[PDB]
Design a protein around this nucleic acid. Sequence first.
RNA 1: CUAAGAAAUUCACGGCGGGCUUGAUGUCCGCGUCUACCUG
Lengths: 80, 297, 326, 325, 331, 242
Amino acid sequence: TMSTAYIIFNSSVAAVVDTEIANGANVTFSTVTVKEEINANRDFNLVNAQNGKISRAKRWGNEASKCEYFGREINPTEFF
Amino acid sequence: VTDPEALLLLPRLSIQNANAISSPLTWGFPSPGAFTGFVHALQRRVGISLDIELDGVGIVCHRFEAQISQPAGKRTKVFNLTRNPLNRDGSTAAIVEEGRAHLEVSLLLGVHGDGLDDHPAQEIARQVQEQAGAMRLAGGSILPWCNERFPAPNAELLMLGGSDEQRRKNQRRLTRRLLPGFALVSREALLQQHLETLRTTLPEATTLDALLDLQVRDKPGWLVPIPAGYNALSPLYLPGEVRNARDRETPLRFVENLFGLGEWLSPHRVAALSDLLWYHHAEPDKGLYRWSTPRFV
Amino acid sequence: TASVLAFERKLDPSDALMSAGAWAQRDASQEWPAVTVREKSVRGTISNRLKTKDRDPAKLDASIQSPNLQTVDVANLPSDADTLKVRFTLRVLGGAGTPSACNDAAYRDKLLQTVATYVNDQGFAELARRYAHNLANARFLWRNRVGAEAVEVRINHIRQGEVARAWRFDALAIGLRDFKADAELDALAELIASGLSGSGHVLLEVVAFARIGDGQEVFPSQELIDKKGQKSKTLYSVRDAAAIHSQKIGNALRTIDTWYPDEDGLGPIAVEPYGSVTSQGKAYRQPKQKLDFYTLLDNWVLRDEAPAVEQQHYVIANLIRGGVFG
Amino acid sequence: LSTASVLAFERKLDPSDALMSAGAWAQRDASQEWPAVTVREKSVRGTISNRLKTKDRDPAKLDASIQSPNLQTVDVANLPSDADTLKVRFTLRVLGGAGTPSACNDAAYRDKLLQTVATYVNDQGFAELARRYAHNLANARFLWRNRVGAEAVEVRINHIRQGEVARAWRFDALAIGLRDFKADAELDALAELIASGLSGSGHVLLEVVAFARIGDGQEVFPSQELILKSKTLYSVRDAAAIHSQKIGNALRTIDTWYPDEDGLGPIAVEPYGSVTSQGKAYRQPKQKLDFYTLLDNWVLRDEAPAVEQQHYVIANLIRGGVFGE
Amino acid sequence: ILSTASVLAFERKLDPSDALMSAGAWAQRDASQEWPAVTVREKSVRGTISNRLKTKDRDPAKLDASIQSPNLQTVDVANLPSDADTLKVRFTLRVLGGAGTPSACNDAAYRDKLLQTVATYVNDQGFAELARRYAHNLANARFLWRNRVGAEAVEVRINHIRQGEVARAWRFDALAIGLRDFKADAELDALAELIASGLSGSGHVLLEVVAFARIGDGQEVFPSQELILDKGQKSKTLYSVRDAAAIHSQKIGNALRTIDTWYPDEDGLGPIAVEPYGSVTSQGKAYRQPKQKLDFYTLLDNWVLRDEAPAVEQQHYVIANLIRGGVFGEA
Amino acid sequence: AKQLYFPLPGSGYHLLAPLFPTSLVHHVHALLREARFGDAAKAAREARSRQESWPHGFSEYPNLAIQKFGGTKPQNISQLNNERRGENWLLPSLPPNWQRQNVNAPMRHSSVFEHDFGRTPEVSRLTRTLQRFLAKTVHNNLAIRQRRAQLVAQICDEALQYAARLRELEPGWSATPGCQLHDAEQLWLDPLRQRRLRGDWPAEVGNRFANWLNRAVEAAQWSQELSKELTMFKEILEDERD
RNA sequence: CUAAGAAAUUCACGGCGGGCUUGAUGUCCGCGUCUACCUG
């Protein structure tokens, strides 16, 4: 339920609560109480589609409450 | 338009299920044209008997809770709905909705009458407040009292009594019971000053009002868009030629709204309490109808 | 009858707040805490009828693999207190027959003549005798009445901050569909008839206790309202307490009509032009039938045929509830 | 003649919420003030062990995904660490007057329906539904997951009439089985009490308490809620509580008249008997043994079903619901 | 045809309680009911910079500037009382039983075939091979995770509380029993048969486990952490039940089921915890790789579908993976 | 229909028929829909956070309302639109204090240990917003001083509402723990029920002025006009309580 | 004389099974609180 960055990786995973890991210094900011998502390798950034919001890019741009997730995270697939 | 003589005050008017839409454009506090007309109805039901004259009202809005929700979606709000009875077939009804509000105000009126000497200064407030607990004031009922402590006693102040220090002392002796609300007054001045500042791009007045509430900029108070009367477009009619009117004694003019902007002051930082009595300037010379508060500043 | 005629309502009730306290402690019912609206969340299976193109045993089992998830609200008594206190303030207005809409003024004064010759020979003491029964048995306790052990309703007359006269009924020995005589209900009916006839409001503050049980459910009124979250069944709260609506009390005050052509052994029905029940669907007193309100207005004031006294009671009760007619 | 366009039935057998508490065993008649089992947060991380869709079945990516951890913050409800008894207290209100729907459209439907129900009632009582609603309180099947693996479960039932009790019942929820429907010299009294409570011949409300001797410091289970943390529990006033309708779903497991097989024990009475756990739906509408084709084939075409299915078609009405689209 | 079950999950057996940590003196072991609780308390620290800097930002004038402003954390720790030396860890373990019957299947034939295969497994051999290994990880107190290393003498002690009383008691010594070999003692077979009869289902088993570890005066115990989700800084909050430091009820119990010795490239590297795709994060990599056919899922689907019963040294693994529970459906 | 009449200046009444305007609701619908989503919204979305298109704005839109027109029956009214199934917006005009939060008044440390704590949303917003006018307004004596003086007067006047809002919030803030910090000023912002027992303490606002207007808040308006407004607030607090 | 007048949304529900959050750390150093006073 967001509008991420330009990563076209796979069916991403996302959460808002984020802790910082220190052990294992190739991965930073491991994500907490995380929830699944599927965009199924869609073209553009806005496709998140948890359960209800797939089409309607105008309604997606209206859905800017919890959006603009940076995506640069523990994995090119996994988003913020 | 002229000066008041006695600030008759109603103590606590709990209102249930009053209107909330009040225009094609707002949805907040009900239109204070209702508060203008409410005291004219009050004078028409009482003021001929006790020989008084009422013209202006103030509003304080002790509290205000609307009836809105959001169905796990936008930050815009949808309204409350009322179930309607069935039709002749007993199937369904073409339901048309409107907002609701539980608002709680306590108005202060303005008296001009000579009847303050023959009738004592507490009987004239014990009859008026007892009358207005049996009438409607925006589309909602007026509630009675519970069984607790009682601020249900009103007051009745005379601004002509005492000297200037006595006036400014009894003004605080009245405002001490009126404090936790927010008085609302007209703000017709700064719009026709903000116009010429905003005249470079577009002079449309609704655009000037719409961007006086929408780093970030500064708002010098709590500005608010309100109705401010009615502009007329149709000419006068005859009293007895129109079909489907409420009576057949007065002429008719079709009207559209007139939007202005107000301000929600605190009761303290006003100059005096003859500055917020909502009269209604009503020039009919191919004109319009307004209701404002002169001596606003 | 010229263009528009509308009647501002009388018998105006208010909202009904709730509280929850014990029994044999109902006398101190001013500090009882509210009954708030907590939420929960339920997982429902499928319990509706399906079409003939449906009901294959493959699509059905694939439907119960995805049950519906909805988050209803609920309101319960706190788990020590078993009695529900509902409180509401009813005021009457008086001046029944006078409308506030008329552009005729020859229809208005003859309407005044008709209501005057109704009120002079017989008072309001028949409609008041049923308006008192609809506060004696707690019809305003809509669903919370049923199954309770002993409902007890209390009515206070208020004119100033004082109380004037206090009643104490028992809404179980009082029947729900009868109308009997009582040594106190006649006095209450005379009070509300004196309020209805003359001018100036006559005020009432009515509470009602119900002994439901420890921590059971209550039922305030609901509220009308993207199939993901789907918060259905939102209740009504004013100042954070479960409140019955005003109209929901209004549909229980005016359950007085027991003069129907169709059924007279069922019970009363709320009064209505084209007298209709939302639950029972079918509208009694149809316009094809001559027992309709709007026919009975013009027959009684324009062509001046006096109907039976039952239909006179019905049309004047319909004038009490107010309305708007074109 | 036909069925109605709207039809609704208010529920009977109305249960409360079920409040939880803990304490020690061998404390009978002194168990009124036990502290409530409170929920609390607790962090949990455990790595990936779901199935794979033969796409990441490669050792190049499984080691990469095993190093991306999955920190969650679930809730939990434990007893106090010196307390080895879980007390669940809830109040059950049996209304009565089973047949009368709260709404209808055709009165000729409605009086025919009441005729059928009254012929059922005066033909044979509510006793067979009563003896089956008692054994979902004799053995505490409302202790859903907290029952399995317990030392001795004991329920005590007090019938309240005024603020005081009227009759007191001590059971032992493991001698009374979870499978067979016995006939004891004391379950008949509770049976006929709920029989008189359903037949409108009075009004009964019971306070039922359940002691489950789980284990000191062990885990108990409340009802779990939705998500918008990753496992929320139901807290009434900072006390863990089973849901109301979950107790309701455990209370109407009386249905032992499947089309399929009597060797698997009872389930909850639904229109289409559809246990969400086992994922299948007994009483399929392709067979003629569901509820929706046992109503209109009893009240319209007026052939009676067998005496077993009458119990199910009444018990589907005591749960209430909405019918007739 | 018996295709795979779309949704399948299992309720666990072997639940552990939460772990409590108390403190005292070693000579008062046999009267240690009212030992005080090892409380958590806040302390402050002051770190430095001890991370591998990248090749670009290795400027000399920046490193000393970055360490001139250190990072002042605020750590919670748990120490024993300064007059006490022996750490007491108490938790209770209940043995449920009926390991085959699932929680939420879809196909009835899958569930019946699953219960039939599990009934054959319980019929030919007992749970005795899968209970002489749980009894070890109660004996050599692996559930003391980091408090075990460098302990002087670890006496663990286990009671059978059938009623409120105790039925039969047991004392061990967790360093006489090694952390690698699974020996055969006379009092790890009276315990192993008890967990065997508890898991098969012929009774009820509740076990009280206390474990005394001798760490020393004023030393530092280790409870388990929590999350610090969302200045006023803090790091490393420990988990305390009612202000008594506590190991989680799944970090305990994770040491109950480090049983798995049957896995490829086993170089004497000790048992790991049983898991589908049997993996440990501390070793970084994941054994029982699915390209090998010695997984769990492709060990269940070749035993409940095509009936190719694997070696008994993997039927001791599949049943133990059923005992821990979990989800197993195509989620 | 739906018509009113208003009183004339010293005469009878004029009946007015307030109809539904259409040409002046579509213009505000167009001028409001584009600022929600469009060129100015999507592009330069981050116009004041990370250096977007400079000649644009942000165009906030708080507390809007919506109002349907029957739903799935779009043939009765005129001027149809397929997106408009009763999709005309409504601007807010709400009177403030429409949440009613100031209920508890506990024995805390922020507002219960310190009198000039003021842990409120509007008070916090007014405290955060005075930094733009708290700068070196040497050439802005009406800007950094007049608007700053008005905002200081507003933040002072809001304290009367933050105190008297609990003026009926209890039978009296009695002897309890934690509220002794509010017990140093337990007359003005405290209950009602002679200088100490028969009088309130009208000097604790002078002690809270250093914490609020000095601790949380050119050198003329920072001490002269603020001191005069504090003297006016002290006179107002003293004239009421006795 | 009030965008005044008018209005019952209701019935029923199983959220549920599983888990390792680890490792380490220096908070340093300096300091004037004074002057008075009738409780009957």
